[PDB]
Amino acid sequence: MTNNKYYTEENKKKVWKKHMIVLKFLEQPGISEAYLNYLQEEIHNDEWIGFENEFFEELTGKPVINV
Amino acid sequence: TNNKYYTEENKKKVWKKHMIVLKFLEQPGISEAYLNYLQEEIHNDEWIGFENEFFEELTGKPVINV
Protein backbone atom coordinates (compact mmCIF):
# COMPACT_ATOMS: atom_id res chain seq x y z
CA MET A 1 0.00 0.00 0.00
CA THR A 2 1.38 3.47 -0.92
CA ASN A 3 2.12 5.77 2.05
CA ASN A 4 0.18 9.04 1.51
CA LYS A 5 2.27 11.90 0.07
CA TYR A 6 -0.26 14.75 0.38
CA TYR A 7 -3.09 13.56 2.63
CA THR A 8 -0.64 13.17 5.53
CA GLU A 9 -1.54 13.91 9.16
CA GLU A 10 0.84 16.88 9.28
CA ASN A 11 -0.98 18.38 6.30
CA LYS A 12 -4.35 17.77 7.94
CA LYS A 13 -3.17 19.90 10.86
CA LYS A 14 -2.00 22.82 8.70
CA VAL A 15 -5.17 22.73 6.57
CA TRP A 16 -7.31 22.67 9.73
CA LYS A 17 -5.42 25.68 11.09
CA LYS A 18 -5.44 27.51 7.75
CA HIS A 19 -9.17 26.83 7.52
CA MET A 20 -9.77 28.56 10.85
CA ILE A 21 -7.95 31.63 9.52
CA VAL A 22 -10.17 31.74 6.44
CA LEU A 23 -13.32 31.19 8.52
CA LYS A 24 -12.65 34.42 10.39
CA PHE A 25 -11.98 36.11 7.06
CA LEU A 26 -15.42 34.98 5.79
CA GLU A 27 -17.06 36.86 8.68
CA GLN A 28 -15.52 40.13 7.44
CA PRO A 29 -18.11 42.62 6.11
CA GLY A 30 -19.19 41.77 2.58
CA ILE A 31 -17.16 38.57 2.38
CA SER A 32 -19.92 36.21 3.56
CA GLU A 33 -22.41 37.44 0.95
CA ALA A 34 -19.84 37.20 -1.87
CA TYR A 35 -19.00 33.71 -0.61
CA LEU A 36 -22.63 32.57 -0.71
CA ASN A 37 -22.97 34.01 -4.21
CA TYR A 38 -19.84 32.05 -5.15
CA LEU A 39 -21.32 28.83 -3.71
CA GLN A 40 -24.51 29.46 -5.68
CA GLU A 41 -22.50 29.38 -8.94
CA GLU A 42 -20.06 26.60 -8.09
CA ILE A 43 -22.83 24.15 -7.17
CA HIS A 44 -23.34 23.87 -10.95
CA ASN A 45 -19.62 23.56 -11.79
CA ASP A 46 -19.07 20.08 -13.23
CA GLU A 47 -15.46 19.89 -11.92
CA TRP A 48 -16.59 19.11 -8.34
CA ILE A 49 -17.22 15.37 -8.18
CA GLY A 50 -18.25 14.16 -4.72
CA PHE A 51 -18.51 17.57 -3.01
CA GLU A 52 -22.29 18.01 -3.23
CA ASN A 53 -22.98 17.43 0.47
CA GLU A 54 -20.18 19.84 1.38
CA PHE A 55 -21.41 22.52 -1.05
CA PHE A 56 -24.85 22.41 0.51
CA GLU A 57 -23.67 22.21 4.11
CA GLU A 58 -21.84 25.48 3.38
CA LEU A 59 -24.61 27.16 1.40
CA THR A 60 -27.22 26.40 4.06
CA GLY A 61 -25.02 27.51 6.96
CA LYS A 62 -24.44 24.09 8.53
CA PRO A 63 -21.40 23.80 10.84
CA VAL A 64 -18.07 23.02 9.23
CA ILE A 65 -17.46 19.91 11.36
CA ASN A 66 -19.85 17.53 13.11
CA VAL A 67 -19.65 16.61 16.81
CA THR B 1 -9.24 8.11 19.36
CA ASN B 2 -11.13 9.79 22.25
CA ASN B 3 -11.28 13.06 20.27
CA LYS B 4 -14.78 14.50 19.89
CA TYR B 5 -13.98 17.28 17.39
CA TYR B 6 -10.53 16.63 15.86
CA THR B 7 -11.62 13.41 14.17
CA GLU B 8 -10.74 11.70 10.90
CA GLU B 9 -14.20 12.20 9.41
CA ASN B 10 -14.05 15.88 10.39
CA LYS B 11 -10.50 16.25 8.99
CA LYS B 12 -11.90 14.89 5.72
CA LYS B 13 -14.79 17.39 5.74
CA VAL B 14 -12.46 20.29 6.57
CA TRP B 15 -10.09 19.28 3.77
CA LYS B 16 -12.87 19.28 1.20
CA LYS B 17 -14.51 22.46 2.48
CA HIS B 18 -11.07 24.04 2.47
CA MET B 19 -10.68 23.23 -1.21
CA ILE B 20 -14.07 24.83 -1.85
CA VAL B 21 -12.93 27.98 -0.06
CA LEU B 22 -9.54 28.11 -1.82
CA LYS B 23 -11.21 28.44 -5.20
CA PHE B 24 -13.33 31.23 -3.71
CA LEU B 25 -10.14 33.04 -2.73
CA GLU B 26 -9.23 33.07 -6.41
CA GLN B 27 -12.35 35.05 -7.33
CA PRO B 28 -11.72 38.65 -8.46
CA GLY B 29 -10.72 40.88 -5.56
CA ILE B 30 -11.18 38.18 -2.95
CA SER B 31 -7.46 37.44 -3.11
CA GLU B 32 -6.44 41.02 -2.30
CA ALA B 33 -9.08 41.36 0.43
CA TYR B 34 -7.77 38.16 2.06
CA LEU B 35 -4.15 39.37 2.00
CA ASN B 36 -5.33 42.73 3.37
CA TYR B 37 -7.14 40.91 6.20
CA LEU B 38 -4.05 38.82 6.96
CA GLN B 39 -2.14 42.13 7.14
CA GLU B 40 -4.74 43.57 9.56
CA GLU B 41 -4.47 40.45 11.73
CA ILE B 42 -0.68 40.01 11.94
CA HIS B 43 -0.34 41.72 15.36
CA ASN B 44 -3.41 40.06 16.91
CA ASP B 45 -3.03 37.99 20.09
CA GLU B 46 -5.78 35.53 19.13
CA TRP B 47 -3.47 34.14 16.42
CA ILE B 48 -0.56 33.03 18.64
CA GLY B 49 0.35 29.54 17.45
CA PHE B 50 -0.66 30.42 13.88
CA GLU B 51 2.53 32.27 12.83
CA ASN B 52 3.81 29.68 10.35
CA GLU B 53 0.33 29.40 8.79
CA PHE B 54 -0.01 33.19 8.56
CA PHE B 55 3.44 33.37 6.90
CA GLU B 56 2.72 30.56 4.43
CA GLU B 57 -0.63 32.20 3.51
CA LEU B 58 0.85 35.71 3.03
CA THR B 59 4.05 34.55 1.23
CA GLY B 60 2.19 32.30 -1.24
CA LYS B 61 3.91 29.21 0.15
CA PRO B 62 1.61 26.17 -0.61
CA VAL B 63 -1.32 25.21 1.71
CA ILE B 64 0.16 21.70 1.96
CA ASN B 65 3.71 20.48 1.21
CA VAL B 66 4.30 16.97 -0.26
Binding site: K13, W16, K17, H19, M20, L23, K24, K62, P63, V64, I65, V67 | N3, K4, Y5, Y6, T7, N10, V14
Partner: peptide
Protein backbone atom coordinates in the same frame (compact mmCIF):
# COMPACT_ATOMS: atom_id res chain seq x y z
CA UNK C 1 -20.20 29.25 15.85
CA UNK C 2 -18.69 26.58 13.59
CA UNK C 3 -15.43 28.37 14.34
CA UNK C 4 -15.65 27.39 18.02
CA UNK C 5 -16.06 23.78 16.95
CA UNK C 6 -12.91 24.19 14.85
CA UNK C 7 -11.16 25.73 17.85
CA UNK C 8 -12.20 22.85 20.11
CA UNK C 9 -10.76 20.40 17.59
CA UNK C 10 -7.56 22.46 17.51
CA UNK C 11 -7.21 22.30 21.30
CA UNK C 12 -7.85 18.57 20.89
CA UNK C 13 -4.79 18.36 18.60
CA UNK C 14 -2.21 18.86 21.35
Amino acid sequence: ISYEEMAKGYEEMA
